[PDB]
Homo-oligomer: A and B are copies of this chain.
Amino acid sequence: LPEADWVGESATDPEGVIKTSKVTWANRTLVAEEVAVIIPVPEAVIDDATVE
């Protein structure tokens, strides 16, 4: 966030100048990552099983 400030008046004092301030932004990222498994089984067991 920027900061505002009280200023007052003067042609010559270090007061009575308006402050400079800044707004800023940052970056957030979605990065896709992979999640996986392998399940091995014998063909004979698939052939003999009474379910898919």
Contact = CB atoms under 8 A, between A and B. Distances in A.
Interface of A: 9, 11, 40, 42, 44-45
Contacts of A42: 9
B44 A9 contact: yes
Give the copy number.
Answer: 2
A8 to B, nearest CB: 10
Nearest to A44: B9
4 contacts: A9-B42, A9-B44, A9-B45, A11-B40
Nearest to A16: B42
Nearest to A41: B11
A46 to B, nearest CB: 12
Contacts of A44: 9
